[PDB]
């Protein structure tokens, strides 16, 4: 039944004028990670 | 440019015959110690002797670290130099033995001439020919060129989402396609759009140029320590850290040495021995010494310089064994010891004048004389500190130079070590 | 659920510090870990030579 | 009403009360007396603002409670923002996730700022309409002086579809990245629309320290400094090349470094291994001018039975400048108490001031500063307006002090 | 928060099947779209640990709580600085209200000399409580 | 030209100067003197190369600079590179990820070699065509012959996940452990300008498509790290294993190695574990060794300590060589007598022969006398020091005067300590 | 079944009456009337559970029954009341601090039993129909009194197919969740009777109404609650090694929610006992924490067995009685155990030998009591089984005096080995 008294968004975002190749590669990295582990993390949804 | 404590020291200052002068390079006095330093500096340039050590012994403030920095400077930049403090060995993440091991593999440099080539320009068209190959047209200010682009890297091409209009890099060796952004002439196509719009390259699309940059052997070891890729969950390597994790002697460094020897035999690589420097060796543990006095006996260990800033004292880790210089007699042998002695009023005055004319402060004669005389009462490392605030007060008073009324008045605002000890004898 | 997401900021000059294609050496000629699951012992010992 | 920051122990300190020639006033900017040490603080502050001779250490010695930390707080306040003033206690380096030497060099890097200039263009207006044709569309922004349409490109349409922003929202759009931010729903969160031009170039400057740069250039999204997840960066591989790249930024027109300030409080907690590292970390170009203080005299050095001033070895003691603080007199103590009362809302009587000054000269200075608020509140208990001598006496009876509590130990407790 | 719960199937379909594993809850009352104000009381350490150990829904960053889940060490710039700034931004606009506390450190006589020496800077802070 | 390994301390020790009858020569293979000690070293090397008994510990002790580490490196060189020889310092086991006992078990298992041999039927040939409809066919080619192969779902999935293409010189075996070995050459310039990092053009294979490959490799018994986790063996390239699960390690590795020894697919070849400066071990590691040496498979031990009656780390007790007596009981101590006026000059001449530092007879005599007065190792540094000092002097042979010139620059431990009367 | 007997398996509880009057040798407890009465008082205080945060210490000579009294209390307490036995040296862990280990130990002896009234069905499956194409089916359950037919739904059909039950099986259907728990098979067999299959076993069908309201109960410890609530790692409270609970975000919330549950009546309380054996191992910091850890309503009573006298406290150089500082020793009241007399040691040996199923002659008892009075009691108890083996090896019936005297010369207790330690083995 416990819950964190506060829940902030996951990323500690960083404002910048970054290079154009960083954000797309990070998005592809997140896409790769999500499509694989979430189907296997489904059983923990009940407790989450 | 951020004048440092040893920025004025630019070399040992020996003559063509190997004798020590009162050279303008930044060192005065210490004739015998500077001669020994210049004699050992030839060992480094000889590139034939490995597994050596030199102990700079002497009272504090006598300039042993200055001698080490002069040795480092005289060599130049081609050979690496890795200054390390003895206290740094005590890492709470990884054992000290492997820390010292890696430290020993960092001095050894490695020069290699890579005649690589990359292709840059606005990508004009992609025509993927089960892909047999993909033709890519790169445009630059000097013309356009079409390249058959190894369909195996079409994966990366799509990963970058690059298409007609973008400016990109590509490395001929591995296919390191890098999207710089959209072309300049395509800007404003949408009056509001999050893009970079990098200028169009001006040089020849075919960019073949040699890179003679050097890398360290420890860098190679680290690059070969952990794997790469996110096959299934191995993506975890872009996350939780990799602090100086321990390599293994039996299967990594041996193969590294084998492959490096192979490449050197082919005439591609070029080895350049470095110089390691350990400050305040007395801080190391007795086990660090027991490992060091046997690891430096190998055939690959680079020449090292030991600096002990104290005399006969108990070695750390035993609390009941006294040895000269805080180094055990077992390890104190095999090490050429160079004594560093105290200076004279004249030498202290010369050092102070050098520091002054290096920092950029002009000082009168009567002022410099008493500033150096203070170097006799106090340590040499106190007049150097007092010199700056004197000029600061002078400039505050309009006077651009340092008169005797400033150096003798600023010595009152700050106290030296001995005066503080005298006052602090009350335990508060 | 605090909307006050911490929001760091810095210029892009701090991120482009490690990108210089025509000034970096190819480390692929020295790597050994990558060859453990791709290359075979026989491939390197008998066939290639 | 009440902010996260309240009336602490060093609120009255607003900076060094020096003249144009670094001459301390009798009492100014919340700093009483302490002429010699305060002017020495001024000299070090001036040579810091200069930022040419780096790698200098100073030690503020003196009896316990002689404004050793007040001088540091005043120096910090005078230096003002835009210049890193790192303050840490000697016990903070003892960390389990990182070695003491690594924590020390980390604090050093944190005490050095890098000034970088940006020339980004930021939009600021209000949304009129957003369109989506499943994809391309158009965007109409509004400000109090003009309205305009915008062609919603791939990035813009995607970002505005992901975000819930809609018509009637004052927003900002960084054309470089496209970060959308809404400062309030509408006219009256709600907030009015912006004024002036809709799109205008804005210069941005970031005083990022070498620590931030290293943490940014260490891992994929390596900006984990927020929780110090890192146990130590790779020395000489990712830490020396950053220095070379910063030097490249310099002497070219790209960036300029800003010498910060480090203040290690209670340095006697640092062990011999930490002092050994300072003997060499203060000899590099990128080294800040640090200050330190210690109330102990010639005590034992943590690590061995050696006795040395400040509990610091001689090798480092001969490497720094000592700044001793003299004990305060009746005048200085009374003026400090008066400034402390002015900081708060308390207003004591003249006889009450004399009684409190005597009480603070009897046992110690800090005890009177602490009794100030106690007597102020006890006065409000009897429904008074001014803190009279009777309230201070009642407090002195209620609350004990170090010297009087130690003497009351005529009954043996645990041990 | 984005969290969507499953209270159960509608109550009117209880007669549809004879026996099922679904739970039946009465048709929710009130408007489909409803808001409400909640007067929550929390501490600053909660925000500190939430920004140091982030969490969220449908984000793979939760992996941090499985392989990188030791106790955190919020840096100075996070424990102080930004958290205090955002809390002040909440306060000065009429949404938050500060309430000091009381830190009762019993059996302090057995702390380490390092703890005692850090208490110096800890108490002198303008944020430290009574 | 300059290799990674230039001349070090123990570089002139290129073997053990013993005859076929293990009779020590006065000067042979770089070693000098130490007749009884080198004969004992050869005796222990004989049982090393034999490899029948396990749990043999030979301790070499003597004054500092008598050749303990020298004899150790001589044995290491006399012993062929095939048998493992793990040389570690007494301080290498004090790890933070490993305990003072698990690191020692890993060091022990690292000195036991295992010559594995494997045989697998390999189908290799240049891919000419790959059709897919799921079912398909494969047209492999060689410079000698060609043939079609019918595939299936399991093979099609492997040909798709591994993006094989017409021309890729594929390598397949039973169980389909396919490898994208190399690419055709007839598809000239598949990459005009930019090529992949893993791509490389290779000539067409020869012979038949089906060829039997035999692979032999010597892996240490510490290969447990290969199965101590789910990693692909790369844990052996860094710290990795820390626990050394006793059940797994023993009851799987030992049993399966014994099974391989019967099938003939492997064979143990015990090595040596040389622990230099072993006096730094605590009573815990010594009491552990006391039992570890009693195991079925355990390499022989070689120790080089110069400690007399000294304290044992982790205790207030004192014992010979600074280690407990219960361990000395399970050792075999060897002597290393100090050198005389003749042996010192001989080893100095040998060391000069290494770096071709041609010295004069008077210089040799003076250096031998200096080394007998102060120390042996010190005289070894003056060789190179005077060589470098004379090189700048525009000379070709170190003289006595050049030796004395260096004698004043680099003072010895004795004279250095004698000069510490100032006490800063 | 097979769990070999231990040194403390003979005591089945304190031999007390209804008035807490200890009997001489009842229920395995021999002699030691004062300490047994004290333990009975503290146990009667335990089964009441209206005050929490007290402690009681049992001190005495080595081998007088401290741990014996602890085990007797544990046994007389029975299940349904958490009892945690821990040695002082167990809290010195590497994955958590000492205070964290102590908090976990305390909260491991606080149980929360949530009474859940879930209605279910229980009957013998007679027939099942399922139309695969959504899929639909039916179910028929039988009990000794009545039968009925059920029109299964889609999810019920899915659950029954996952369980894949068949006719004749006796199952329980949770009306809420639909979980099918099969207790066994009724008198039915032979799916085909021509295919292979294991041996058949049958059990009686359920009785009474088909659908009946029964009472399930879920009893977990506060430590298990804080654990599974610590982090989102799935199936915690076993996880083989790891507890890193946070003080406020979890612990205080667990306490508050347990108080709320007690308020409305979901699970009120069931305090336990934390027997900390050899508490002299705890560090000064452990006692410092215990000082204020007992000052909580969720602090269960603890029992400590001490063998030390006036000895320095571990972690410091402060001499104090029982090796415990007078700060923590101020709360706990101490109980004294009298050394067993001749008739007490004799009867203890008699009971301990009757527990191991060994017969010893009347003179065997006398000689063994002689040995256990000149020597320690534990050695005389250990000599009961050692002497019981030579007798069997000689095909004997009951242990004689000669067998005991031979096994006494075969071994050495504590003094015949130190007296012979005159060879200077090693030091
Ligand atoms: N021969 C010299 N010439 C010029 N400056 C010197 C010389 N010797 C010492 N110094 C000065 O004295 C200081 C001694 O510092 P350091 O080398 O750290 O002391 P030590 O090495 O004795 O511990 C240096 O900052 C250096 O500028
Ligand atoms: N120059 C000054 N002006 C105003 N207040 C002062 C001055 N010097 C000291 N104080 C007061 O006296 C107290 C001395 O305590 P502090 O300086 O913090 O002790 P320490 O420096 O030993 O930690 C401070 O709380 C401060 O408010
Ligand atoms: N018999 C020998 N032949 C050649 N060189 C020797 C001989 N004995 C000793 N040395 C030299 O003397 C040095 C002694 O070093 P080391 O073996 O570490 O001393 P020890 O083993 O006595 O502690 C070695 O570097 C080696 O080159
Ligand atoms: N009251 C008792 N009744 C029966 N046996 C006892 C009793 N007290 C002690 N014993 C016997 O003493 C042996 C060890 O006692 P122990 O619990 O270790 O005492 P202590 O806790 O004082 O060391 C046990 O094997 C047990 O059989």
UniProtKB/Swiss-Prot annotation, chain B:
It catalyses: ATP + H2O = ADP + phosphate + H(+). Pfam families: TIP49 (PF06068), TIP49_C (PF17856). Changing residue 64 to M: No effect on interaction with NOPCHAP1. It is an enzyme of class 3 (hydrolase). One of its GO terms (cellular component) is ribonucleoprotein complex. Keywords: Acetylation, Activator, ATP-binding, Cell cycle, Cell division, Chromatin regulator, Cytoplasm, Cytoskeleton, DNA damage, DNA recombination, DNA repair, Growth regulation, Helicase, Hydrolase, Isopeptide bond, Membrane, Mitosis, Nucleotide-binding, Nucleus, Transcription, Transcription regulation, Ubl conjugation. Ubiquitously expressed with high expression in heart, skeletal muscle and testis. InterPro entries: AAA+_ATPase, P-loop_NTPase, RuvB-like, RuvB-like_C, RuvBL1/2_DNA/RNA_bd_dom, TIP49_P-loop. Its main location: nucleus. There is a cross-link at residues 202, 422 (Glycyl lysine isopeptide (Lys-Gly) (interchain with G-Cter in SUMO2)). Binding to MYC is dependent on a Myc domain essential for oncogenic activity. Belongs to the RuvB family. This is RuvB-like 1. It comes from Homo sapiens (Human). The gene is RUVBL1.
Swiss-Prot record, chain C:
Catalytic component of the SRCAP complex which mediates the ATP-dependent exchange of histone H2AZ/H2B dimers for nucleosomal H2A/H2B, leading to transcriptional regulation of selected genes by chromatin remodeling. Acts as a coactivator for CREB-mediated transcription, steroid receptor-mediated transcription, and Notch-mediated transcription. Interacts with CREBBP and EP300. May be part of a complex containing SRCAP, CREBBP, CARM1 and GRIP1. Component of the chromatin-remodeling SRCAP complex composed of at least SRCAP, DMAP1, RUVBL1, RUVBL2, ACTL6A, YEATS4, VPS72, ACTR6 and ZNHIT1. Component of a NuA4-related complex which contains EP400, TRRAP/PAF400, SRCAP, BRD8/SMAP, EPC1, DMAP1/DNMAP1, RUVBL1/TIP49, RUVBL2, actin, ACTL6A/BAF53A, VPS72 and YEATS4/GAS41. (Microbial infection) Interacts with hepatitis C virus (HCV) NS5A. It comes from the Eukaryota. It comes from Homo sapiens (Human). This is Helicase SRCAP. It is linked to Floating-Harbor syndrome: A rare genetic disorder characterized by proportionate short stature, delayed bone age, delayed speech development, and typical facial features. The face is triangular with deep-set eyes, long eyelashes, bulbous nose, wide columella, short philtrum, and thin lips. Belongs to the SNF2/RAD54 helicase family. SWR1 subfamily. It is found in: Nucleus. The chain holds residues 917 to 965 of 3230 of the full protein.
From Swiss-Prot, chain E:
There is a cross-link at residue 29 (Glycyl lysine isopeptide (Lys-Gly) (interchain with G-Cter in SUMO2)). Disulfide bonds: none annotated. Ubiquitously expressed with high expression in heart, skeletal muscle and testis. It is found in: Nucleus matrix; Nucleus, Nucleoplasm; Cytoplasm; Membrane. There is a cross-link at residue 29 (Glycyl lysine isopeptide (Lys-Gly) (interchain with G-Cter in SUMO1)). Changing residue 107 to Q: Reduces ATPase activity. Decreases interaction with NOPCHAP1. No effect on formation of RUVBL1-RUVBL2 heteromeric complex. High level of autoantibodies against RUVBL1 are detected in sera of patients with autoimmune diseases such as polymyositis/dermatomyosistis and autoimmune hepatitis. Possesses single-stranded DNA-stimulated ATPase and ATP-dependent DNA helicase (3' to 5') activity; hexamerization is thought to be critical for ATP hydrolysis and adjacent subunits in the ring-like structure contribute to the ATPase activity. Component of the NuA4 histone acetyltransferase complex which is involved in transcriptional activation of select genes principally by acetylation of nucleosomal histones H4 and H2A. This modification may both alter nucleosome-DNA interactions and promote interaction of the modified histones with other proteins which positively regulate transcription. Binding to MYC is dependent on a Myc domain essential for oncogenic activity. Belongs to the RuvB family. This is RuvB-like 1. The lineage of its organism: Eukaryota, Metazoa, Chordata, Craniata, Vertebrata. The gene is RUVBL1. The chain holds residues 197 to 326 of 456 of the full protein.
UniProtKB/Swiss-Prot annotation, chain F:
Ubiquitously expressed. Highly expressed in testis and thymus. Keywords: Acetylation, Activator, ATP-binding, Chromatin regulator, Cytoplasm, DNA damage, DNA recombination, DNA repair, Growth regulation, Helicase, Hydrolase, Isopeptide bond, Membrane, Nucleotide-binding, Nucleus, Phosphoprotein, Transcription, Transcription regulation, Ubl conjugation. It catalyses: ATP + H2O = ADP + phosphate + H(+). GO terms for cellular component: centrosome; ciliary basal body; cytoplasm; cytosol; dynein axonemal particle; euchromatin; extracellular exosome; Ino80 complex. It is found in: Nucleus matrix; Nucleus, Nucleoplasm; Cytoplasm; Membrane. GO terms for biological process: box C/D snoRNP assembly; cellular response to estradiol stimulus; cellular response to UV; chromatin remodeling; DNA recombination; DNA repair; establishment of protein localization to chromatin; negative regulation of canonical Wnt signaling pathway. InterPro entries: AAA+_ATPase (IPR003593), P-loop_NTPase (IPR027417), RuvB-like (IPR027238), RuvB-like_C (IPR041048), RuvBL1/2_DNA/RNA_bd_dom (IPR042487), TIP49_P-loop (IPR010339). It is an enzyme of class 3 (hydrolase). The modification Phosphoserine is found at residue 414. It comes from the Eukaryota. Its main location: nucleus. Signal peptide: none annotated. ATP binds at residues 62-69. There is a cross-link at residue 421 (Glycyl lysine isopeptide (Lys-Gly) (interchain with G-Cter in SUMO2)). One of its GO terms (molecular function) is TFIID-class transcription factor complex binding. Belongs to the RuvB family. The C-terminal domain is required for association with ATF2. This is RuvB-like 2. It comes from Homo sapiens (Human).
């Amino acid at each position: 039944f416990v819950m964190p008294p506060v829940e902030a968004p996951p990323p500690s975002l960083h404002a910048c004028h970054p290079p154009p190749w960083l954000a797309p590669r990070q998005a592809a990295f997140q896409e790769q990670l999500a499509s694989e582990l979430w189907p296997r993390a489904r059983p923990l949804h009940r407790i989450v | 440019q951020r004048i440092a404590s040893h920025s004025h020291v630019k070399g040992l200052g020996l003559d063509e015959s190997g004798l020590a002068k009162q050279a303008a390079s930044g060192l005065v006095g210490q004739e015998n110690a500077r001669e020994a330093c210049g004699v050992i500096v030839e060992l480094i340039k000889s590139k034939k002797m490995a597994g050596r050590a030199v102990l700079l012994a002497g009272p504090p403030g006598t300039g042993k670290t200055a001698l080490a920095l002069a040795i480092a400077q005289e060599l130049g930049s081609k050979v690496p130099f890795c200054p390390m403090v003895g206290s740094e060995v005590y890492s709470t993440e990884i054992k000290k033995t492997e820390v010292l091991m890696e430290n020993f593999r960092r001095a050894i440099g490695l020069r290699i001439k890579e005649t690589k080539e990359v292709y840059e320009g606005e990508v004009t068209e992609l025509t993927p020919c089960t892909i047999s190959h993909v033709i890519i047209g790169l445009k630059t200010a000097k013309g356009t060129k079409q390249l058959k682009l190894d369909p195996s890297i079409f994966e990366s091409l799509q990963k970058e989402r690059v298409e007609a209009g973008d400016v990109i890099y590509i490395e001929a060796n591995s296919g390191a396609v890098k999207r710089q952004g959209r072309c300049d002439t395509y800007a404003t196509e949408f009056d509001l759009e999050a893009e970079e719009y990098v200028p169009l390259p001006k040089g020849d699309v075919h960019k073949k140029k040699e890179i003679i940059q050097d890398v360290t052997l420890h860098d190679l070891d680290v690059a070969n320590a952990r794997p790469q890729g996110g096959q299934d969950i191995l993506s975890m390597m872009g996350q939780l850290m990799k602090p100086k994790k321990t390599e293994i002697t039996d299967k990594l460094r041996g193969e590294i040495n084998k492959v490096v020897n192979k490449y050197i035999d082919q005439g591609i690589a070029e080895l350049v021995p470095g110089v390691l420097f350990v400050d305040e060796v007395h801080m190391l543990d007795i086990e660090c010494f027991t490992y060091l006095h046997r690891a430096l006996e190998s055939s690959i260990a680079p020449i090292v310089i030991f600096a002990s800033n104290r005399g006969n004292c108990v070695i750390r880790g035993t609390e009941d064994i006294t040895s000269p210089h805080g180094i055990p007699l077992d390890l104190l042998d095999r090490v050429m010891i160079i004594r560093t002695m105290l200076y004279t009023p004249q030498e202290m005055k010369q050092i102070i004048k050098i520091r002054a004319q290096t920092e950029g402060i002009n000082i009168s004669e009567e002022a410099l004389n008493h500033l150096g005389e203070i170097g006799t009462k106090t340590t040499l490392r106190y007049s150097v500190q007092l010199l700056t605030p004197a000029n600061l007060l002078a400039k505050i008073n309009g006077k651009d130079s340092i008169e005797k009324e400033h150096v003798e008045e600023i010595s009152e605002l700050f106290y030296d070590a001995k005066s503080s000890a005298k006052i602090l004898a009350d335990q508060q | 659920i605090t909307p006050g997401i911490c929001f760091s900021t810095a210029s892009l000059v701090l991120r482009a510090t490690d990108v210089h294609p025509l000034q970096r050496i190819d480390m692929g000629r020295f790597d050994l870990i990558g060859l453990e699951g791709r290359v075979s012992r026989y491939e390197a010992d008998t066939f290639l030579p | 009403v009440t902010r996260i920051e309240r009336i602490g122990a060093h609120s009255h300190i607003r900076g060094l009360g020096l003249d144009d020639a670094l001459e301390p006033r009798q009492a100014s900017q919340g700093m009483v007396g302490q002429l010699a040490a305060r002017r020495a603080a001024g000299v070090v502050l001036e040579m810091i603002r200069e930022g040419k001779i780096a790698g200098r250490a100073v030690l503020i010695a003196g009896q316990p409670g002689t404004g050793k930390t007040a001088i540091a707080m005043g120096m910090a306040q005078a230096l003002g923002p835009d210049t890193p003033f790192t303050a840490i206690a000697g016990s903070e380096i003892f960390s389990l996730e990182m070695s003491k030497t690594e924590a020390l060099t980390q604090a050093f890097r944190r005490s050095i700022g890098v000034r970088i200039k940006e020339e980004t263009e930021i939009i600021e207006g209000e949304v009129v309409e957003i369109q989506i044709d499943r994809k391309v569309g158009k965007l109409t922004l509004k400000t109090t002086e003009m309205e305009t349409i915008y062609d919603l490109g791939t990035k813009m349409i995607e970002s505005l579809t992901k975000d819930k922003v809609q018509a009637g929202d004052v927003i900002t759009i960084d054309k470089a990245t496209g970060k959308i931010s809404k400062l309030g729903r509408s006219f009256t969160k709600f907030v009015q629309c912006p004024d002036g031009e809709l799109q205008k170039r804005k210069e941005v400057v970031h005083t990022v320290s070498l620590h931030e740069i290293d943490v940014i250039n260490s891992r994929t999204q390596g900006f984990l400094a927020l929780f110090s997840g890192d146990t130590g960066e790779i020395k000489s591989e990712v830490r020396e090349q950053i220095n070379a790249k910063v030097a490249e930024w310099r002497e070219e027109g790209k960036a300029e470094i800003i010498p910060g300030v480090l203040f290690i409080d209670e340095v006697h907690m640092l062990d011999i291994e930490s002092f050994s590292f300072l003997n060499r970390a203060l000899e590099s170009d990128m080294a800040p001018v640090l200050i330190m203080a210690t109330n102990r005299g010639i005590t034992r050095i943590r690590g061995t039975s050696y006795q040395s001033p400040h509990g610091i070895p001689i090798d480092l003691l001969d490497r720094l400048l000592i700044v001793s603080t003299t004990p305060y007199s009746e005048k200085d103590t009374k003026q400090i108490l008066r400034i402390r009362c002015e900081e708060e809302d308390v207003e004591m009587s003249e006889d009450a001031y004399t009684v409190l000054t005597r009480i603070g000269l009897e046992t110690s200075l800090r005890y009177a500063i602490q009794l100030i608020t106690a007597a102020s509140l006890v006065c409000r208990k009897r429904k008074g307006t001014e803190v009279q001598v009777d309230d201070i006496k009642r407090v002195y009876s209620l609350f004990l002090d170090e010297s009087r509590s130690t003497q009351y130990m005529k009954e043996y407790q645990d041990a």
